[PDB]
C-alpha cells in the first residue's frame, strides 16, 4: 500500500505546514501538523476545555462508530518551545492520503497551552519520530508510521516541503520525478528517539566549505534552523547590520539586506538553502528589523534541521531495520 497527501503552509512565512487527515467512521477530516520531532498523534476534540478552543476543527469520538476508549490511558507532552497538552486516548481508524491504519491511538486533548489555542489553522499534531518517545501511559503506543510499516510497499516516507507553496508527504514509495540528481543517504542514530544524523559541514554564501561534524535532528515540526553559535555567528557576520537581540531573542537584520545562501553537507553532497528562505520578515508590523531563519542552538541542547533546511531538499525518512536519512536537491 501507499499514501500521498498535500501539505500546505499555514501562513505567508511558512511558519508550519498542515496536512488533511481522516479520522473515524464516517471520516472526520482534521488538518494536522506532521512532526518528525515527536511521536504523539493528538487532536483538538469534544473533550477539550471549551475555553481553549478558538476556531479549530475538533474530533468527536462519540460520532465515530470505530472509536474505542483506551481505558486508563493518559498522555502528557511538552515541546521544546514550552508548549504543552494532555488528555486521554481513543483508538480509531486513521487515513492519510489513501493509506489507512486501523486501531491507531488517537490522543484526545483535554488541556492545551496558549500557543495551540492561538493557532486556529492547526487541529493537532501527527508525530513521526520513533515510537520510544510516545508519551501514552501506562501502555506506550506506536506512531502512525510504525503501524503502517507492515502494509507499505517500502518502509519509507518522504517530505517535499514547499517554499511559500504547497508540498507533499508520501508514504511507502519514492517519487523519482520529485528530485534532481541522486539521493545521498546518511546514517541515523535512534538512541534519543529522533531522526538524528551528522552533517559534514557548511558554507556561507560563496565562501569555502568548512568540514566539521554537526550532529542534529531532521524535524519537520520546527520552523527554523538551529545550529551551534560558532556557525551562526559566521553566517550573520556576512550581513551588514545583523545583530543578536536579547529583547527579540535571536538574530535580526535590516529588512533592506539581501541574505547569503547557506550550504550544509550530507556526506559528500551539498544542499544549498537560498538566502530568501532565511528571511522571516519584520519582527513586528511595519518594523525595519527582520527576523533571521538561522538561530543558535546554544539554549536548546540540540541542533535542529527544521523546515528552513528541509524545504530546500527532497528528504527520505527510511524506516528499514537500520534507519537512514536521504537528501536530494530539487
From Swiss-Prot:
It is an enzyme of class 3 (hydrolase). GO terms for molecular function: aspartic-type endopeptidase activity. The active site is at 35, 199. It comes from the Eukaryota. Disulfide bonds join 255-290. Its EC number is 3.4.23.22. The keyword Disulfide bond applies. The keyword Protease applies. Residues 17-328 form the Peptidase A1 domain. It catalyses: Hydrolysis of proteins with specificity similar to that of pepsin A, prefers hydrophobic residues at P1 and P1', but does not cleave 14-Ala-|-Leu-15 in the B chain of insulin or Z-Glu-Tyr. Clots milk. One of its GO terms (biological process) is proteolysis. Keywords: Aspartyl protease, Disulfide bond, Hydrolase, Protease, Signal, Zymogen. Belongs to the peptidase A1 family. This is Endothiapepsin. It comes from Cryphonectria parasitica (Chestnut blight fungus). The gene is EAPA. The chain holds residues 90 to 419 of 419 of the full protein.
